[PDB]
Amino acid sequence: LDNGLLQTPPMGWLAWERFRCNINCDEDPKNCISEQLFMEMADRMAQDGWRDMGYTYLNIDDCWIGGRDASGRLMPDPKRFPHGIPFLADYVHSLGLKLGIYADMGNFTCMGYPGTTLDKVVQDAQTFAEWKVDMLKLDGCFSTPEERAQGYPKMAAALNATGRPIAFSCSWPAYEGGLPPRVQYSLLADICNLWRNYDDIQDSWWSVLSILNWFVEHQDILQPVAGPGHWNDPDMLLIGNFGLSLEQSRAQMALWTVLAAPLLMSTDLRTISAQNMDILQNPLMIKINQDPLGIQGRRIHKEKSLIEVYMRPLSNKASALVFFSCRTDMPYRYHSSLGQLNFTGSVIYEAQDVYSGDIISGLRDETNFTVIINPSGVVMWYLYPIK
Amino acid sequence: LDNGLLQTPPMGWLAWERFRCNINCDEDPKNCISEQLFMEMADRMAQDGWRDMGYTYLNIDDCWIGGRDASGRLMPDPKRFPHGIPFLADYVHSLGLKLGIYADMGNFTCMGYPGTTLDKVVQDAQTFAEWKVDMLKLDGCFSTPEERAQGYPKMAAALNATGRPIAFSCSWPAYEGGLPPRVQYSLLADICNLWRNYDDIQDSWWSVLSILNWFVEHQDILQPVAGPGHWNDPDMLLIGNFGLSLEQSRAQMALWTVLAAPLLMSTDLRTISAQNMDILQNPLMIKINQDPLGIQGRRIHKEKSLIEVYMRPLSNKASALVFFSCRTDMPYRYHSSLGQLNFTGSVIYEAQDVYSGDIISGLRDETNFTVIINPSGVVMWYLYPIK
Ligand SMILES: *[C@@H]1O[C@H](CO)[C@@H](O[C@@H]2O[C@H](CO)[C@@H](O[C@@H]3O[C@H](CO[C@H]4O[C@H](CO)[C@@H](O)[C@H](O)[C@@H]4O)[C@@H](O)[C@H](O[C@H]4O[C@H](CO)[C@@H](O)[C@H](O)[C@@H]4O)[C@@H]3O)[C@H](O)[C@H]2NC(C)=O)[C@H](O)[C@H]1NC(C)=O
Ligand SMILES: *[C@@H]1O[C@H](CO)[C@@H](O[C@@H]2O[C@H](CO)[C@@H](O[C@@H]3O[C@H](CO[C@H]4O[C@H](CO)[C@@H](O)[C@H](O)[C@@H]4O)[C@@H](O)[C@H](O[C@H]4O[C@H](CO)[C@@H](O)[C@H](O)[C@@H]4O)[C@@H]3O)[C@H](O)[C@H]2NC(C)=O)[C@H](O)[C@H]1NC(C)=O
Ligand SMILES: *[C@@H]1O[C@H](CO[C@@H]2O[C@@H](C)[C@@H](O)[C@@H](O)[C@@H]2O)[C@@H](O[C@@H]2O[C@H](CO)[C@@H](O[C@@H]3O[C@H](CO)[C@@H](O)[C@H](O)[C@@H]3O)[C@H](O)[C@H]2NC(C)=O)[C@H](O)[C@H]1NC(C)=O
Ligand SMILES: *[C@@H]1O[C@H](CO[C@@H]2O[C@@H](C)[C@@H](O)[C@@H](O)[C@@H]2O)[C@@H](O[C@@H]2O[C@H](CO)[C@@H](O)[C@H](O)[C@H]2NC(C)=O)[C@H](O)[C@H]1NC(C)=O
Ligand SMILES: CC(=O)N[C@@H]1[C@@H](O)[C@@H](O)[C@@H](CO)O[C@@H]1O
Ligand SMILES: CC(=O)N[C@@H]1[C@@H](O)[C@@H](O)[C@@H](CO)O[C@@H]1O
Ligand SMILES: *[C@@H]1O[C@H](CO)[C@@H](O)[C@H](O)[C@H]1NC(C)=O
Ligand SMILES: *[C@@H]1O[C@H](CO)[C@@H](O)[C@H](O)[C@H]1NC(C)=O
């Protein structure tokens, strides 16, 4: 979407994966979907280095809506958002952050909240703009294929017509099998800043793997359509939550990074461990994710040892390499060379291990190297020529 | 097996899961299957509380064998075990520990090392007893069903004839699909102290779930056959390794405990975290696993919320409850009462949370309680009547 926004993948925090549709504030005031939840998270983002590292979006997901007023204007839940959305947006803006919101192109949101039907698209768009929202996620529950085909471009137009730059996250392709011919990626690139291609992430390694495997199976189609202003969205980061081990947490961060994926956290930032913070706030990882060229990486190698190699092209002739172990036994000594990974010329490279910080110099195409990769884990290299 | 051994499930360390068939001592001297590895693990068990908590078995798995000598006598790898097995048994005994070893009822071990064929059963048994081995895992690769049917009873008899008490772990059922009509569990209980029913565990939550699932689907068969001296064996604990998150690690521990499974670690005790050690060395957890009655627990409840409840009967009218979340979203507030979990009327109960140590008291059948369970995690209660 040619709206000046998201020339790099969006970084921030989204409520859904960790906090879901928890509306029971009476029994659970600290974790329910409420203005308090968002204000506290915003505070964490401002104070704990998140915003300074590039995590700027703070996104409301489903279950925020109270209803529509006498004029049909959406309103938040009065008990859970007492000061209103404009107040929240102001708060978020004052901390140097951006506010995202959620709506559904259909009769209802997936959790049954008032939907943005075709005749409400313009009104809701104007409402979000008036509120000074910075990002919209438009879901596609309770709609027909025809309604989505009309509705998603309708919202893009409506958002444009408001004059406010609003990042546009489209769930459209996820409701269509995510593939051509049903999905027209050329159109999506023109109307959206990013799109959910595939299934919702759940807090498990199995879920991460199923998403990865789908993106890799269809990378010939998906890799080229991504770039500055228009991204594939494989869904939220799970880092900080319950389902992933340490190795798996580091793996998702690395793999979402080579895929030029959004870096959208969904975890309790109030109680997040230093170890998980270290993953998410890795300065080199973020630099690679935010690379100005915006070229989505690819799986370039799969071996019978169940070691996979991913590669992402970067600016200044640099590359990102992710050595990924799908093994479930023990650490594995992966022996390779840059020549075997389709690097050419007589260029002498140097690599920095993204997690350990170690530097490997004197890497020519023929130079044999070993990386030790842990089960369900990664070794990641930032690779560059030296002279 | 009526040899006076394993009246409670065996506790210890088994090499396989973590260290597999690593024989590269030149490149990897710290982690290869070697005399050194077993002594170092034994030192850790002696010095780090493991022995004191009841972990007494240090078990060699596959890839130890060097060959057979001129008399057909089994020999360890002379390079990796330069002092031989008696040296290792003697070392381990001097630390108040017991030594386990591995053989295969078939032409070869699963990794292709010399097998204990039918004509070698008696000789190898005598060798192991002479070495002062305390436990044997008899694997079943590269054999026919009839060879196993002769071989397993033959080995039990041959071990007995040595006069040395040797705990007998039988992989027999795992090669026969683990179920009736092919597996006769009354037979197994007579000839074995424990048996591997099912698939090799791998370092993943998927693996743990598939094993759990199989054991739960067939609990009507499997639960009654377990008892003092004869245990079901769902395979090694993954706690301390790569594939399990903290919640999942606590879950496997709790679930193996309600299943009256062996507590056989397979992890690097040299580098094990405090947090993983705390799981494995939990005194109440061990007490429950080692309950003198040896009654295998059952899954008693499965809600559409994907909360499962397991119950294990214990001595002194006590019980173990495991509330297990198969959810992959967020913490869940599970609402229940002991009456809903089919407990006896008019009795007042008290429960200690096995992980937090908290005591919930004054629980009648009708008393509503709430337990907060994390995704892929558990809450575990030690429950008892109070006067
Ligand atoms: C509604 O929809 C329209 C599209 O139909 C959007 O209009 C586009 O807005 C974007 C963002 O503001 C414009 O992109 C920017 O153009 C700037 C100037 O380019 C002009 O000059 C060239 C001459 O070759 C023309 O071809 C072109 O049409 C423009 O008239 C650039 O300076 C900007 O560059 C950015 O990137 C560089 C990195 O290389 C940075 O250094 C800069 O700082 C800067 O960020 C940028 O490319 C685009 O021109 C508009 N398109 C059209 C067709 O008009 C509206 O934004 C949209 N409205 C809303 C609110 O959504
Ligand atoms: C090789 O194989 C032989 C034969 O199978 C094994 O010998 C058996 O060893 C077990 C375990 O030590 C013995 O079981 C125990 O017997 C005790 C006394 O039983 C006597 O009375 C019975 C008849 O009632 C006779 O069969 C027997 O000969 C004895 O004279 C019991 O008191 C023990 O009870 C245990 O359980 C009870 C309740 O369940 C508890 O209250 C106790 O605490 C206690 O733990 C137990 O049952 C068995 O008697 C032996 N059988 C025979 C035929 O000799 C060898 O041990 C084995 N050797 C090696 C090296 O592997
Ligand atoms: C367990 O091991 C026995 C013993 O034989 C041993 O293992 C074999 C694989 C060979 O490496 C032998 O040198 C070794 O002593 C196995 O029985 C033997 O199997 C082999 C291989 O199939 C038989 O040879 C074959 O004979 C047929 C028919 O004539 C030919 O078509 C083949 O080309 C080949 O020569 C051999 O006759 C047989 N020996 C005896 C005495 O039975 C057995 O296969 C193995 N079992 C299991 C469960 O794997
Ligand atoms: C999206 O909703 C529309 C609106 O109709 C609603 O649902 C009806 C079943 C009923 O509860 C109305 O009061 C609601 O307003 C659906 O369009 C209707 O479809 C039904 C078939 O079930 C048909 O009988 C009606 O004539 C339709 N309404 C009109 C006047 O257009 C639509 O089906 C919903 N989309 C989906 C598939 O979820
Ligand atoms: C594809 C898509 O947007 N998926 C969303 C998910 O991310 C979340 O927003 C949920 C809330 O009810 O509704 C959908 O399933
Ligand atoms: C069922 C069974 O015993 N499984 C074993 C496994 O536990 C391990 O010992 C391996 C060694 O090569 O051989 C088999 O797969
Ligand atoms: C890389 O290692 C292999 C051994 O597996 C060796 O044959 C080869 O010569 C090495 N490559 C170079 C150029 O050193
Ligand atoms: C337990 O809670 C339920 C509501 O879930 C309530 O209806 C019931 O009366 C309660 N039982 C007791 C004895 O408190």
From Swiss-Prot, chains A, B:
Listed under GO biological process in this entry are: carbohydrate catabolic process; glycolipid catabolic process; glycoside catabolic process; oligosaccharide metabolic process
Compartments where located? Lysosome
Binding site residues for substrate: D61, D62, K137, S171, R196, D200
Where are residues bearing Phosphoserine located in the sequence? S305, S315
Q: Which UniProt keywords apply?
A: Disease variant, Disulfide bond, Epilepsy, Glycoprotein, Glycosidase, Hydrolase, Lipid metabolism, Lysosome, Phosphoprotein, Signal
Which EC number(s) does UniProt give? 3.2.1.49
User: What cellular component GO annotations does this protein have?
Assistant: cytoplasm; extracellular exosome; lysosome; membrane
Per the UniProt entry, the glycosylated residues are N107, N160, Q184, N342, N368
> What positions does UniProt annotate as the active site of this protein?
D139, D200
InterPro entries reported in the protein's UniProt record: Aldolase_TIM, Glyco_hydro_27, Glyco_hydro_27/36_CS, Glyco_hydro_b, Glycoside_hydrolase_SF, Melibiase/NAGA_C
Q: Which GO terms describe its molecular function?
A: alpha-galactosidase activity; alpha-N-acetylgalactosaminidase activity; protein homodimerization activity
Q: What is this protein's function per UniProt?
A: Removes terminal alpha-N-acetylgalactosamine residues from glycolipids and glycopeptides. Required for the breakdown of glycolipids.
Q: How does it assemble?
A: Homodimer.
Any additional notes? Answer: Alpha-galactosidase B was first found to be an isoenzyme of alpha-galactosidases, but apparently it differs from alpha-galactosidase A in substrate specificity and is alpha-N-acetylgalactosaminidase.
Q: Which family does it belong to?
A: Belongs to the glycosyl hydrolase 27 family.
Q: Which disease is it linked to?
A: Schindler disease: Form of NAGA deficiency characterized by early-onset neuroaxonal dystrophy and neurological signs (convulsion during fever, epilepsy, psychomotor retardation and hypotonia). NAGA deficiency is typically classified in three main phenotypes: NAGA deficiency type I (Schindler disease or Schindler disease type I) with severe manifestations; NAGA deficiency type II (Kanzazi disease or Schindler disease type II) which is mild; NAGA deficiency type III (Schindler disease type III) characterized by mild-to-moderate neurologic manifestations.
Q: What is this protein called?
A: Alpha-N-acetylgalactosaminidase
Q: What is the lineage of its organism?
A: Eukaryota, Metazoa, Chordata, Craniata, Vertebrata
Name the gene that codes for it. NAGA
